[PDB]
Design a binder for this molecule. Structure first.
Ligand SMILES: [Mg+2]
Ligand SMILES: [Zn+2]
Ligand SMILES: [Zn+2]
Lengths: 246, 149, 76, 99, 1331
DNA sequence: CTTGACCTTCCCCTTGCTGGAAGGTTTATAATGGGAGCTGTCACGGATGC
DNA sequence: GCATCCGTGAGTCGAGGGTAATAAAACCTTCCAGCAAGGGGAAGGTCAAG
RNA sequence: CUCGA
C-alpha cells in the first residue's frame, strides 16, 4: 500500500521504524493465522490451543493471561477482535528485544530476516535483493493541500499605499521581498524588475493601462513613478525637510 | 487501533475527557446512536434515587481547527458494564484506545524516483477503501447590518 | 532556440544585446504586422524572433537598415 | 469585570486550544511556558536558558518541545511530575531501606 | 527628472507648499459624516470628498471643471487630490526641531559652539542665556541662572539682553555671522599644531562652509510654521460595523492644534509667567512628540497603553516605507502551492495545476477569447470562465505554451534561488518540480511551498528564456563546479549499475557492442554485475573540430556497457570504467561541459536522471535490522577499557595520581577504545567472501545495503555508521567539559534511560544553535549587499600594469590550495616565463583557462602575477579584464553585469553552514630568505633575526613546506642541505626566549650594581648562577633610570665589534634577564648569555574591521630603538632612524612581550609585540596589496575548514569596496585633512596637476572602513537612508544641501526605474550620452 | 416642421404651534504637591565630562 | 586623555486567530423641521392634430 | 502569540 524511501534512515538514525515495521509484520502474521483458523470454522478448543501459545513468548513478561478461565463464548469474541491483527504493547525504555521479534515471526510462518522477495508490478520480473515489507502506523496531518493552494490575478488593493493586500482569505498576492530583488539584480533582468515594482503592484495609472494592453493583445510595458515613493516624499516633507526632484 | 503501541494509549483516551465513561456499574438497557441508558447495579445505588443514568452523546459538531467531533457507542444491547469503562469512543478513540492514524503495508525501496526526497508513493486501495478521508465542518455567517440609507 | 539559447548568443555576442534585439524584433510582428521570415510551425512571437536571430537573418544593423529604408519609402 | 475579562481573553498565556485530537487537547494543558509577564522574551534569551539542566530528570521532558524560535522556552511537564504546595516540581521515588 | 535634492525648509517654502491654515482641532461631524470647516480634514483646504461634487451639492456633473462654490468654498476637482495637498499651522511661539537638536552630534550646538547640556537648560525654561552684552562683563552665550539674572538686571540696567526659551536660541542663531567665524577658524587652524583639535576644527569649518555652499540659513532649525500631512495618508475610514478606524497622526496633530490655540488664548488673558512658561514648554513637548516620539522624555501613550507611532517611526526599521513598502512590494499575478516531485519532466519544464493557471492567465484568456469571436465582450467572456466550459481548456493550452513562468522559494539565498521554467498542465493541486533543480533551491519535499510569478511584457518574457531559464544555470556563480550534480537516488542507481561480482551468472563471455548487452540483461541470461569483454567505439576529438573513431576490446562489466549508450560522442571510456560514486558523476558532467558545450550537457544530465531512477528501482536496496552488523569483538574491547579504568581509579583512591591526571587518563583510554571498535565494525562491513569460479574464497567489497549508501556518497558518512554498529563516542554536558563515562550502547541495541538523557544535551545544543545562527548569517548578507550594491563592470580594458601575486598556501604541512584552481580564470599581469629565465610562454594579458593552466602544471612555475579588482584604475566600476572570468557562463564577463550583488550573495549564502622541533615530511632542498647567521661552537648554525622562515623546496622549484623559525634558534644543518623526511633541523626551547651572543670573545659583567640597579639570585640546587635582575614591578623603584647595560668586552676591556660593522656590541637588560655563564668567561658564537622566559563571528569581525583587544603592534619607520621616558605605567620608546627624522616616539603599556630589545634594529611593518594584528595598521604601514592579501587568506580559512568552496575573487570585490574613502594630508586643490573619496581625489589629479598647473599636490592616504560604515558614507544618500540610522543620515544630509545623482542600483529600485546593470545598462548609456 | 394641451417631478407656501439640535453663562461652608512602570541580552561606536 | 554613559542593531516567506473601557445641572438663546391637507407655480417631457 | 519550511 505504501512504497517509502530507504535513504532516509542512515542520515537521521531513526531505526525505530525498521523495528516497528518488523513487529507490525509479526503482529499481522499472527492476525492472519487466526483469520485462517476462523474461516475454516474448525473448533473452539483449537483457538485456545493457539492464542494461548501467542500470549506468552517473552522471557520475563509482566502480564500473565490464561485462557482457561475464559468461557467458551468469550474466546470467540476475543478471536473476532484479533482477526485484523494481534495488538502488541512495547513500553518506552522497557522494549521488546531483537530476539523476541524473531521468536514471534516464527510463530506465524514468516521469514526471520523480515525481508521478502517482491515481484515488480509493471514488468513482472523480480528484484535482485530481498525487500523489507511490514506495517507502519501512518498518520495524516493538518497541512492539507486544499488550504495552501492560492492564485490571484487582480483585486482588493490597499488603502494608503495602493499595493495589493496579503493573505489567502484576504485574496492577496505573494510578497516580492528584497531577498528576491537582489536575486533579480544579480541576473541583470532589469525589465522583470521594472515590471514587478511599478506596473504590477504600486502604480495607479499603470495597472489599468496594462490590463487594456494585455486584453487588447499587445504586451507593452508602460512605466510610471510608484505611489509608495510620493507618499515617502510627503512624509519627509512634513518634517520641515524640503525634498524635491529636478 | 495501532498494532504496535506502548500501553499508554489506554490512559490518554480516558483522562482527556473525550469519551463517555460510566460513573456507576450495571447492565445496559437501551443503546441508540444518540443516547445510552444504563441500569445501575443494586449495591451501587443511593437510597433516594431511581437508579438510571442517561448519557447523551454529542453528534457532529465543530472543533476549533474545523474538524469533526462525533461519539459513537461501542457497547451492545444487554451486556454488563463495570465502573470506569468506556461506553462511547470519540473522534480518534477505538474501544478506549487512542488511535490517531491507520496502519498499512509499507515497503522500503526506491521506485522510479516517485519517492525521491522524503516523498511517499501511495497505492490506490488507500483511496478506494476510505482509509484516510477526513471530515471538515466549516461555518459561514451572513450578517445584515443597518446602513443609514 | 526553444530549449537553450546557446546558438543565438554566439552570433550577437552577449545576452543583454540578444534580449534587446529579440524584444525589438518580436514587437514588429505583434502590433506592427510585419511578417516572419522563418516558417512559424505554431509558435508565439518570441521564439520566432529567437529563431530568426540564430539563422543570421536578424541583427541590429539589419534591423536598423530594414526600418530606415522603409522610413525613406514612407517619405516617398 | 474589566481586569478579569482582560486576563481571560487578552493575555499571552490565555491561548487558543488545539482541538484536532484527544492527544493534542491533553498535551496543551500540561504545557509549561516560560514567556509572558514577569518572564523572558524571544529576543533576549541565550543558549543558557534553552539548555537541558541535569535537574530536569523526571520533572520536565527533554524531547518534547517546539523547534522554531522558542525552542527551549516552551517546556512540557513530565508524566509523574506533581506540583508542590509552594510551586516547585516534585517527582516520586521508592525508598531503599537496608538493600 | 534625473536628480533628487534635499535641504532645509524656509517658512516661505512651507507657505508655498500650503493651501490654507488649519485652525480648529475638529475632524468630522457626528451625525452626518462630513468634514468640518477649517478642521484636519477640511474640504476647502485639501479638496472635495467625492468626484466632482462640492460639499453642499450646488455643483456636479463634470460641467463645472474648475469652479469654486461660493457657499462652501470647495474647488470642484477629483478626490484624488486629497493625497497631494498640504496645509500648515501657524505656531504662536517658535519651537525647536528635534532632529536638529537631539541627534548625535547635536548639530545646533555644533554650530553655536555650546554643549547640549547647556542648550537644554534654555529650551526648558530653566536658565537664561545672554544674546549680546554691551558691557563685556557678560560675554556671548554666558548662561545666567534664575537668581543671577536679578543681580545682572540691577547692576547694568538694560545694557544687556537675556532671553529664555526657543526664541532665545532663534535669536542666537539669527545674530551670528558665518563669514567672521569661518575666516577666524581658518586662520587659527593653520596656526596651532595638534591632532586632538584638528579632527574637530576641520569638522566645524566644513559645517560652516557647507552652510554657505548649500545656501541655507541657520534660522530654519527652529520651526515657526509646521506643515500638515495630506488627509488621505492618515485616513479616517469607517469599518463594516460602524466603528471608525483612524491613524494616530490625528491625535498628535490634534494635540499640537489644541495647545497652540490655548497658547493663543493665554497670551491675550495677560496670564502670569508660571502659566505661560509652562504652556510654551507643553507646546514644544507636543511638537517633538509628533516629529519623533520616543526621544525627548517619556514616550506619549494613547488609550491602549501603547506608544503612538510618530512621523519618524514611519520611515525607519523593518516597518518603514523604506524597508517594507519600497524595496519589496506585494505583486499581482502570483501564486502559492505545495511542491511535489515528478521525474517524467525535462530540465526546463515544471508542472502547474489547471486551477492555478486558469487564475494566473486570466487576462490572456480574455484576450484570446475575444480575438476568436467566441465571446463578444469581456462581460460575456468572464461567464465562459466562470462555467469552465469546453473551449476554455483548449485555449489555455495555446496561451500557456512558449510562455515561461518564474518559481521563487523563500528564503532566496543566492542567485539560483529564483529560476524560470516552461510550464505544462497537470490535474491536481501541487506544483510538480524537476528532481535535479532541488540542489539549487535547497528544497526537500516535506511540505515546502514555492511562489509562482508570471512575466507579463514582451521584454520580461525574453529575460526569462535567455537569462533565467533552468537550462542556462548549470554552473554555480560561487565556483566553477556544477550545480545540477545528481542527488541521492540517481547516484545510488549509478553506483549499483557500475560494480562487479565474481561469479555473477555468466562472466567471461565476449560481446559485440553495448546494444547486445541490454539484450543479455533484459532476458536474464547475464546479470547486471559481470566481468566481460565488449567491443566499443569511442570518439576522441583532439583533431581540431573533427571526431576520430577508434575500436578496441575493453575488459569491463555488463553495467558499464549498458550505461555507455547514454554518454555523448567526444568523451572517452575511462569516465565510466570506474565504480562511479558521487564525485565521479559531477566530474563527468564537468568534463562534458568543458569539452563538448552546453547543448549535449543538458541532454546528458537528463538521461542520467532517467537511467539512475530506473536501475535503482530494479535493484531494491532495503534497510533491514540484519544490515547493521555489530562487530563480534565489541564486548571484549569494552571489558578491557573497563579493566583499564579501574587501575587509574584505584591509583586515585590511594595517593599516587592527582584528579587532573586521572580525568585525562580516563579520556585518553576511552578515545583509543572507541577507535578500536570504530575500526572493527568498518573492517567487518566492507568485506564479503564469495565463492570463485573454482571452489575458493575470494573477498570483494560488500553488497551490504547500508554500506552502499555510505560508500556511494548518496546519504550519510562513515561518522554516522559508527553510531549504528560501534559505540557513541563521548557526549559532553553543556558546560563544555567532557563526561567521563561514554555511551557504550548504539542505536541498534538501544540506549539506556540515563544514556538517553545524557544524549539530549548535544541535540538540544545543536538544535538551539541553528535558531540563533541564521539571524547573524542573514544579517551579514544584508550588510554585505548594501555595501557592494553599485559595482558594475563598466569598461573593457585599462592599462594598469599591476596586480597581486599568487602563491599556493603552504602552512604547516601539505598544500591546501594548489595553483591549478587558485589562479584559474584571471588574466595575467606580467608576462611570466619559464624557470629557465627567458622564453616567455604566456603573454601579458591572456585569460588563464583550461589548456593554459595544466601547461603551467607540467612545468615547475610557482608564482603568477594576475590582475585583480583591488587595483583597477577606472572610476565607478571595474574593467572586464581586471575582473577575470564570469564563473557562471565560462567566458570573459560582459560589460553590464552587476558584480557586487553576486559577490555578496556568494559570501553570505553558506554562512548558515559554518559554525620545539621542525620535522620535514619529504625529501627536498632547503631555502631561506632575509637571514643573518653565524656558525655555532659545535659546528651548526644559529639564527639572529626575526623574519626568517624555513622553506623546503622540492626537486623542481615549488615550495612544499614553509616553516617558521624564531630568533635565537640553534639549527642542526646549514643553508641549502639535502634532508631526510622526518629529520629534525631546528632545536630551540619552547618556553624561554634566549638572547644568544654572536661575538667570539671574552665577556665581562659591566655596569651592574647589586641592590640599586639589579638584584641577586643564587641557584639553590646547582650553584652555577650569576648577576640577575628582577622584573618590572617587583624590582627596586630607585634605579629604573640607571639602565644596567652588560657591555661585553674582552680580557683587556676593549669594545668588541658587531660582525661586519665598526660599532661596539652590548647586551642590555630587560626584566627576568637571568644570565647563567659566569664573569670573565670565554665564549664563541652560539653561546647563550641569558634565557628570559615568557567560525562565523570571525568573518563578521574581519569584514567589520574591528580592532582586536590585544593588538600586535608594529614599528612605524625603520631605525634603532631605545627606551626614553620612564614608567608612569607606560614608558616610552623612541624610533631613531639612522638616516631619517629622530624624534618619533610611542607609548607601550603591558610589558609582557617585547620582541625587540633596547639595542636591536627593526624595519617598517614588523612585530614588536605578538598576537593578532589590526587590519588598519596593515594598510597604514604596509601597502594595499598586504590588506587584500591578509583578508583572502584569513576568511578563506573559515570556509575551507568547514568544507565550503568559495572562489577568492568574491572577497576582493568587497575589500575594494571597503578602502574607498581616502583622506588627504597635503593640500593644493580642496582642503587639508577632510575625508574625500579616492575617486574624486583621483579625477582632480587627472585634471588639475597635468595641464592646468604643475604638481600643486593632492597626495592622500588610503583608509579602511568597516561594512557598517562604508555604506553610511557614500555619495547618494538614498542608498544610505534605507540601510540603517535613517534619522542620522537624513539629518546629516539636510543641513549640508546634499544632492543625489541616482548612480547605483538601489535608488533606481526605489524610484521605479531601470537599474544601470544587465539589460538596463545598454539603455542607460543613451540617457547618459544625450545629456 | 408647428401649436396648444396636457403630463412629470420638485420647491415654496398656507396656521398654531411643538419637538429637537447646537451654543453660551452661572453656581459663595470648605476643599491647596501624581503615579505607573520598569528590572532575565550583547556588542559595539562614539559622545561626554571631569 | 581616558574611564564611563548613552544610541542602535539583532533572518525570510506563509497559515489562524481578531475588531476593547467608565464618570453634572439649571437656566438662557437662535435656528430648523414637522404636522393636521392640499394650493401654487416653475423647469422639462409627451400627444394629437394641422 | 501558536504552527509550518
Ligand atoms: Mg522542507
Ligand atoms: Zn459647493
Ligand atoms: Zn582595469
Amino acid at each position: 500500500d505504501i512504497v517509502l524511501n530507504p535513504l532516509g534512515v542512515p542520515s537521521r538514525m531513526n531505526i525505530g521504524q525498521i523495528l516497528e515495521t518488523h513487529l507490525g509484520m509479526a503482529a499481522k502474521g499472527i492476525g492472519d493465522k487466526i483469520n485462517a483458523m476462523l474461516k475454516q470454522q474448525q473448533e473452539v478448543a483449537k483457538l485456545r490451543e493457539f492464542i494461548q501459545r501467542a500470549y506468552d513468548l517473552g522471557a520475563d513478561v509482566r502480564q500473565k493471561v490464561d485462557l482457561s478461565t475464559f468461557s467458551d463464548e468469550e474466546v470467540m469474541r476475543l478471536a473476532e477482535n484479533l482477526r485484523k491483527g494481534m495488538p502488541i504493547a512495547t513500553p518506552v525504555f522497557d522494549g521488546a528485544k531483537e530476539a523476541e521479534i524473531k521468536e514471534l515471526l516464527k510463530l506465524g510462518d514468516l521469514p526471520t530476516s523480515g525481508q521478502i522477495r517482491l515481484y515488480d508490478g509493471r514488468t513482472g520480473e523480480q528484484f535482485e535483493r530481498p525487500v523489507t515489507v511490514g506495517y507502519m502506523y501512518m498518520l495524516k496531518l493538518n497541512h492539507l493541500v486544499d488550504d495552501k493552494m492560492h492564485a490571484r490575478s487582480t483585486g482588493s488593493y490597499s488603502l494608503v499605499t495602493q499595493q495589493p493586500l496579503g493573505g489567502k482569505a484576504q485574496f492577496g498576492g505573494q510578497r516580492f521581498g528584497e531577498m528576491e530583488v537582489w536575486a533579480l539584480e544579480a541576473y541583470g533582468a532589469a525589465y522583470t524588475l521594472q515590471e514587478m515594482l511599478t506596473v504590477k503592484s504600486d502604480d495607479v495609472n499603470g495597472r489599468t493601462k496594462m490590463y487594456k494592453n494585455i486584453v487588447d493583445g499587445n504586451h507593452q510595458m508602460e512605466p510610471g513613478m510608484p505611489e509608495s515613493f510620493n507618499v515617502l516624499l510627503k512624509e519627509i516633507r512634513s518634517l520641515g525637510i524640503n525634498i524635491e526632484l529636478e | 487501533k495501532p498494532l504496535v503501541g506502548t500501553g499508554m494509549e489506554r490512559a490518554v483516551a480516558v483522562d482527556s475527557g473525550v469519551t463517555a465513561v460510566a460513573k456507576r456499574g450495571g447492565v445496559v438497557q437501551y443503546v441508540d446512536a444518540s443516547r445510552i441508558v444504563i441500569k445501575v447495579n443494586e449495591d451501587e445505588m443511593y437510597p433516594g434515587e431511581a437508579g438510571i443514568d442517561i448519557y447523551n452523546l454529542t453528534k457532529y459538531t465543530r472543533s476549533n481547527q474545523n474538524t469533526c467531533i462525533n461519539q459513537m457507542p461501542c457497547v451492545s444491547l444487554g451486556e454488563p458494564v463495570e465502573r470506569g469503562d468506556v461506553l462511547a469512543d470519540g473522534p480518534s478513540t477505538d474501544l478506549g484506545e487512542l488511535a490517531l492514524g491507520q496502519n498499512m503495508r509499507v515497503a522500503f525501496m526506491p521506485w522510479n524516483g516517485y519517492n525521491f526526497e522524503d516523498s511517499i508513493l501511495v497505492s490506490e486501495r488507500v483511496v478506494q477503501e476510505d482509509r484516510f478521508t477526513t471530515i471538515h465542518i466549516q461555518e459561514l455567517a451572513c450578517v445584515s447590518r443597518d446602513t443609514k440609507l | 532556440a526553444r530549449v537553450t539559447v546557446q546558438d543565438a548568443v554566439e552570433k550577437i555576442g552577449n545576452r543583454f544585446d540578444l534580449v534587446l534585439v529579440a524584444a525589438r524584433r518580436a514587437r514588429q510582428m505583434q502590433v506592427g504586422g510585419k511578417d516572419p521570415l522563418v516558417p512559424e510551425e505554431n509558435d508565439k512571437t518570441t521564439v520566432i524572433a529567437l529563431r530568426e536571430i540564430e539563422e543570421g537573418l536578424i541583427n541590429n544593423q539589419i534591423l536598423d537598415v530594414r526600418e530606415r529604408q522603409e522610413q525613406q519609402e514612407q517619405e516617398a | 469585570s474589566a481586569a478579569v475579562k482582560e486576563f481571560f481573553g487578552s493575555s499571552q498565556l490565555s491561548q487558543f486550544m488545539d482541538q484536532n485530537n484527544p492527544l493534542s487537547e491533553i498535551t496543551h494543558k500540561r504545557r509549561i511556558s516560560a514567556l509572558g509577564p514577569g518572564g523572558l522574551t524571544r529576543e533576549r534569551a541565550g543558549f543558557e536558558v534553552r539548555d537541558v539542566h541535569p535537574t530536569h530528570y523526571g520533572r520536565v521532558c527533554p524531547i518534547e518541545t517546539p523547534e522554531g524560535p522558542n525552542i527551549g522556552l516552551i517546556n512540557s511537564l513530565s508524566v509523574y511530575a506533581q506540583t508542590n504546595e509552594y510551586g516547585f516540581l516534585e517527582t516520586p521515588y521508592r525508598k531503599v531501606t537496608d538493600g | 527628472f534625473d536628480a533628487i535634492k534635499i535641504a532645509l525648509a524656509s517658512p516661505d517654502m512651507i507657505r508655498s507648499w500650503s493651501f490654507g491654515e488649519v485652525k480648529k482641532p475638529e475632524t468630522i461631524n457626528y451625525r452626518t459624516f462630513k468634514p468640518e470647516r477649517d478642521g484636519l480634514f477640511c474640504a476647502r483646504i485639501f479638496g472635495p470628498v467625492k468626484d466632482y461634487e462640492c460639499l453642499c451639492g450646488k455643483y456636479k456633473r463634470l460641467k463645472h471643471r474648475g469652479v469654486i462654490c461660493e457657499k462652501c468654498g470647495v474647488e470642484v476637482t477629483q478626490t484624488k487630490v486629497r493625497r497631494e495637498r498640504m496645509g500648515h499651522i501657524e505656531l504662536a511661539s517658535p519651537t525647536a526641531h528635534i532632529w536638529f537638536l537631539k541627534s548625535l552630534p547635536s548639530r545646533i550646538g555644533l554650530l553655536l559652539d555650546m554643549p547640549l547640556r547647556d542648550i537644554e537648560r534654555v529650551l526648558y525654561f530653566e536658565s537664561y542665556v545672554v544674546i549680546e552684552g554691551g558691557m563685556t562683563n557678560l560675554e556671548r552665550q554666558q548662561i545666567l541662572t534664575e537668581e543671577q539674572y536679578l543681580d545682572a538686571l540691577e547692576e547694568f540696567g538694560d545694557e544687556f539682553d537675556a532671553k529664555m526659551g526657543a526664541e532665545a536660541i532663534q535669536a542666537l542663531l539669527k545674530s551670528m555671522d558665518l563669514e567672521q567665524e569661518c575666516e577666524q577658524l581658518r586662520e587659527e587652524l593653520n596656526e596651532t599644531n595638534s591632532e586632538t583639535k584638528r579632527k574637530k576644527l576641520t569638522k566645524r569649518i566644513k559645517l560652516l562652509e557647507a552652510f554657505v555652499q548649500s545656501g541655507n540659513k541657520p534660522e530654519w532649525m527652529i520651526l515657526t510654521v509646521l506643515p500638515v500631512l495630506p488627509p488621505d495618508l492618515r485616513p479616517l475610514v469607517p469599518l463594516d460595523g460602524g466603528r471608525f478606524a483612524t491613524s494616530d497622526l490625528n491625535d498628535l496633530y490634534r494635540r499640537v492644534i489644541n495647545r497652540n490655540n490655548r497658547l493663543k488664548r493665554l497670551l491675550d488673558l495677560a496670564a502670569p509667567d508660571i502659566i505661560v512658561r509652562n504652556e510654551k514648554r507643553m507646546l514644544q513637548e507636543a511638537v517633538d512628540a509628533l516629529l519623533d516620539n520616543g526621544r525627548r522624555g517619556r514616550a506619549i501613550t494613547g488609550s491602549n497603553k501603547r506608544p503612538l507611532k510618530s512621523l519618524a517611526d514611519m520611515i525607519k526599521g523593518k516597518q518603514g516605507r523604506f524597508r517594507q513598502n519600497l524595496l519589496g512590494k506585494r505583486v499581482d499575478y502570483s501564486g502559492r502551492s505545495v511542491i511535489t516531485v515528478g521525474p517524467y519532466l525535462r530540465l526546463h519544464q515544471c508542472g502547474l495545476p489547471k486551477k492555478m493557471a486558469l487564475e494566473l492567465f486570466k487576462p490572456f484568456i480574455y484576450g484570446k477569447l475575444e480575438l476568436r469571436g467566441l465571446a463578444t465582450t469581456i462581460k460575456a467572456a468572464k461567464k465562459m470562465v466562470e462555467r469552465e466550459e469546453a473551449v476554455v481548456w483548449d485555449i489555455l493550452d495555446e496561451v500557456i505554451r512558449e510562455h515561461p513562468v518564474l518559481l521563487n522559494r523563500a528564503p532566496t539565498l543566492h542567485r539560483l534561488g529564483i529560476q524560470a521554467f516552461e510550464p505544462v498542465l497537470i490535474e491536481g493541486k501541487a506544483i510538480q518540480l524537476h528532481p535535479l533543480v532541488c540542489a539549487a533551491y535547497n528544497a526537500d519535499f516535506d511540505g515546502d511551498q514555492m511562489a509562482v510569478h508570471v512575466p507579463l511584457t514582451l521584454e520580461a518574457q525574453l529575460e526569462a528564456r535567455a537569462l533565467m531559464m533552468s537550462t542556462n544555470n548549470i554552473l554555480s556563480p560561487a565556483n566553477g563546479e556544477p550545480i545540477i550534480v545528481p542527488s541521492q537516488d540517481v547516484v545510488l542507481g549509478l553506483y549499483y549499475m557500475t560494480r562487479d561480482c565474481v561469479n555473477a551468472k555468466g562472466e567471461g563471455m565476449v560481446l559485440t557492442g553495448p546494444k547486445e548487452a541490454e539484450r543479455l540483461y533484459r532476458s536474464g541470461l547475464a546479470s547486471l554485475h559481470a566481468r566481460v569483454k565488449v567491443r566499443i567505439t569511442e570518439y576522441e576529438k583532439d583533431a581540431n573540430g573533427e571526431l576520430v573513431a577508434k575500436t578496441s576490446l575493453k575488459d569491463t562489466t555488463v553495467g558499464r556497457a549498458i550505461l555507455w549508450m547514454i554518454v555523448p560522442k567526444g568523451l572517452p571510456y575511462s569516465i565510466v570504467n570506474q565504480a562511479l560514486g558521487k564525485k565521479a558523476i559531477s566530474k563527468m558532467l564537468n568534463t562534458c561541459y568543458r569539452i563538448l558545450g552546453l547543448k549535449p550537457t543538458v541532454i546528458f544530465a537528463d538521461q542520467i536522471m532517467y537511467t539512475g531512477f530506473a536501475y535503482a528501482a530494479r535493484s531494491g536496496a532495503s534497510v533491514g535490522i540484519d544490515d547493521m552488523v555489530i562487530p563480534e569483538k565489541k564486548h571484549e574491547i569494552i571489558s578491557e577499557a573497563e579493566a583499564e579504568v579501574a587501575e587509574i581509579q584505584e591509583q586515585f583512591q590511594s595517593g599516587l595520581v592527582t584528579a587532573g591526571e586521572r580525568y585525562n587518563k580516563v579520556i585518553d583510554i576511552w578515545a583509543a577504545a572507541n577507535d578500536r571498535v570504530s575500526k572493527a565494525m568498518m573492517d567487518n562491513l566492507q568485506t564479503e567472501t564469495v565463492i570463485n569460479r573454482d571452489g575458493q574464497e575470494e573477498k570483494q567489497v560488500s553488497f551490504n545495503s547500508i554500506y552502499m549508501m555510505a560508500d556511494s556518497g548518496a546519504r550519510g558518512s562513515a561518522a554516522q555508521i559508527r553510531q549504528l554498529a560501534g559505540m557513541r563516542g563521548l557526549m559532553a554536558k553543556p558546560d563544555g567539559s567532557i563526561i567521563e563515562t561514554p555511551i557504550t550502547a548504539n542505536f541498534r541495541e538501544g540506549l539506556n534511560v540515563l544514556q538517553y538523557f545524557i544524549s539530549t544535551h548535544g541535540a538540544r545544543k545543536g538544535l538551539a544553535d541553528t535558531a540563533l545562527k541564521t539571524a547573524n548569517s542573514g544579517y551579514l548578507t544584508r550588510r554585505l549587499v548594501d555595501v557592494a550594491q553599485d559595482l558594475v563592470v563598466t569598461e573593457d580594458d585599462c592599462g594598469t600594469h599591476e596586480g597581486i601575486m599568487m602563491t599556493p598556501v603552504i602552512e604547516g604541512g601539505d598544500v591546501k590550495e594548489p595553483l591549478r584552481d587558485r589562479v584559474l580564470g584571471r588574466v595575467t599581469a606580467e608576462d611570466v616565463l619559464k624557470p629557465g629565465t627567458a622564453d616567455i610562454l604566456v603573454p601579458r594579458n591572456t585569460l588563464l583557462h583550461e589548456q593554459w593552466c595544466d601547461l603551467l602544471e607540467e612545468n615547475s612555475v610557482d608564482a603568477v602575477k594576475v590582475r585583480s579588482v583591488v587595483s583597477c584604475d577606472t572610476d565607478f566600476g571595474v574593467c572586464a579584464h581586471c575582473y577575470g572570468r564570469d564563473l557562471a557562463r565560462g567566458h570573459i564577463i560582459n560589460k553590464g553585469e552587476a558584480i557586487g550583488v553576486i559577490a555578496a550573495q556568494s559570501i553570505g549564502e553558506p554562512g548558515t553552514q559554518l559554525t620545539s622541533s621542525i620535522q620535514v615530511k619529504n625529501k627536498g632542498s632547503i631555502k631561506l630568505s632575509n637571514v643573518k647567521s653565524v656558525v655555532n661552537s659545535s659546528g651548526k648554525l644559529v639564527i639572529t633575526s626575526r623574519n626568517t622562515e624555513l622553506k623546503l623546496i622540492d626537486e623542481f622549484g615549488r615550495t612544499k613546506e614553509s616553516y617558521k623559525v624564531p630568533y635565537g634558534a640553534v639549527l642542526a644543518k646549514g643553508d641549502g642541505e639535502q634532508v631526510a623526511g622526518g629529520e629534525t633541523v631546528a632545536n630551540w626551547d619552547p618556553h624561554t626566549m634566549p638572547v644568544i651572543t654572536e661575538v667570539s670573545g671574552f665577556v665581562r659583567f659591566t655596569d651592574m650594581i647589586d641592590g640599586q640597579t639589579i638584584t641577586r639570585q643564587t641557584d639553590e640546587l646547582t650553584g652555577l648562577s650569576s648577576l640577575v635582575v628582577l622584573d618590572s614591578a617587583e624590582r627596586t623603584a630607585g634605579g629604573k633610570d640607571l639602565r644596567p647595560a652588560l657591555k661585553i668586552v674582552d680580557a683587556q676591556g676593549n669594545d668588541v665589534l658587531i660582525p661586519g660593522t665598526d660599532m661596539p656590541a652590548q647586551y642590555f637588560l630587560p626584566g627576568k634577564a637571568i644570565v647563567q655563564l659566569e664573569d670573565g668567561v670565554q665564549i664563541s658564537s652560539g653561546d647563550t648569555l641569558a634565557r628570559i622566559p615568557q567560525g562565523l563571528p570571525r568573518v563578521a569581525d574581519l569584514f567589520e574591521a574591528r580592532r582586536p583587544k590585544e593588538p600586535a603592534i608594529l614599528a612605524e619607520i625603520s631605525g634603532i630603538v631605545s627606551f626614553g621616558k620612564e614608567t608612569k605605567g607606560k614608558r616610552r620608546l623612541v624610533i631613531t632612524p639612522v638616516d631619517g627624522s629622530d624624534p618619533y616616539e610611542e607609548m607601550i603599556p603591558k610589558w609582557r612581550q617585547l620582541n625587540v630589545f633596547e639595542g636591536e634594529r627593526v624595519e617598517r611593518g614588523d612585530v614588536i609585540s605578538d598576537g593578532p594584528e589590526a587590519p588598519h595598521d596593515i594598510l597604514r604601514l604596509r601597502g594595499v596589496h598586504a590588506v587584500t592579501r591578509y583578508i583572502v587568506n584569513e576568511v578563506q580559512d573559515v570556509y575551507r575548514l568547514q568544507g565550503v568552496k568559495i572562489n577568492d575573487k568574491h572577497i576582493e570585490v568587497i575589500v575594494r569596496q571597503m578602502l574607498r574613502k581616502a583622506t588627504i594630508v597635503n593640500a593644493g586643490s580642496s582642503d587639508f585633512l577632510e575625508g574625500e573619496q579616492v575617486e574624486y581625489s583621483r579625477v582632480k589629479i587627472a585634471n588639475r596637476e597635468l595641464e592646468a598647473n604643475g604638481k600643486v599636490g593632492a597626495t592622500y592616504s588610503r583608509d579602511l572602513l568597516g561594512i557598517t560604515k562604508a555604506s553610511l558614507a557614500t555619495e547618494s544618500f538614498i542608498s544610505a537612508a534605507s540601510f540603517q540610522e535613517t534619522t542620522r543620515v537624513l539629518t546629516e544630509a539636510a543641513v549640508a544641501g546634499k544632492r543625489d545623482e541616482l548612480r547605483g542600483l538601489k535608488e533606481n529600485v526605489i524610484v521605479g526605474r531601470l537599474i544601470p546593470a544587465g539589460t538596463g545598462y545598454a539603455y542607460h548609456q543613451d540617457r547618459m550620452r544625450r545629456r
